[PDB]
């Protein structure tokens, strides 16, 4: 809940886990990998493009 | 049971109100029928009888 509550996104999707389960399983090794693309290249972050 | 009637289902915060705005994906999705893929993207009939 400390992402919808002062910073708007415009595309938010989690490959092999549903968003609203992040609250009931657990986590390990959480790593964030930050960057900045050009808004044409949001759908090549994706397992499994060119 | 057979569903029929179709909402906007809501994941996560901001309510959609069947306006589908963010975080409002569609139930229905549309598959791939094609030769050009896998083998597991080919389409089965299955028929259950009881």
Redesign the interface.
């Given at each position: 809940?400390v992402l919808?509550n002062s910073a708007s996104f415009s595309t938010?999707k989690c490959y092999g886990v549903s968003?609203?389960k992040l609250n009931d399983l657990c986590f390990t090794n959480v790593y964030a990998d930050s960057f900045v693309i050009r808004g044409d290249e949001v759908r090549q972050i994706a397992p499994g493009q060119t | 049971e057979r569903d029929i009637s179709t909402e906007i289902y809501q994941?996560?915060?901001?309510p959609c109100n069947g306006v589908e705005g963010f975080?409002c994906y569609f139930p229905l999705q549309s598959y791939g029928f094609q030769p050009t893929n896998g083998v597991g993207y080919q389409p089965y009939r299955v028929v259950v009888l009881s």
């Open positions: 809940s919808y938010f968003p609203t | 994941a996560g915060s901001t975080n």
